[PDB]
């Protein structure tokens, strides 16, 4: 799709059989979702850092559908003030900013 | 331009005769720049809020050039971990996310 920026660019995502929403955030390096579970192995990762780091769980090679488009990539599960799709998945979408 | 998302989408800006850089941030409602001065009247604005709000100065109807494209809009001046171009100016650019 072509998404204008008059509103926050919130899209529907499907991940691990869970239907959720998330913000397409070009100011985020990584994807962070709070309200899901994922199976199998993970690795600890520290995010944030201003006033302290937050420990989250890094899940690799995760199949995720974003606004109807299926991709694979890294998903961090842990606290976040909003679900965020970061550049790591937007590059898998082929997503560009255009003006 | 067409900007891919393999790196942070940092662009050159020109504002009030000052050449600077800033991140095109679709996860930001507003534009916030730290390292500039602007002339004339402003209004106080509170931003942030998690752990407390930060007071900044809102400047209205500011002419700003973003990656060579001249627009007009609101600019907040005050502390920010990085200079940010938010959706308020990206709508003035006609900027879309496309995939």
From Swiss-Prot, chains A, B:
It comes from the Viruses. Residues 1-5, 49-55, 88-99 are annotated as: Dimerization of protease. The active site is at 25 (for protease activity). Residues 20-89 form the Peptidase A2 domain. Homodimer, whose active site consists of two apposed aspartic acid residues. This is Protease. It comes from Human immunodeficiency virus type 1 group M subtype B (isolate BRU/LAI). The chain holds residues 501 to 599 of 1447 of the full protein.
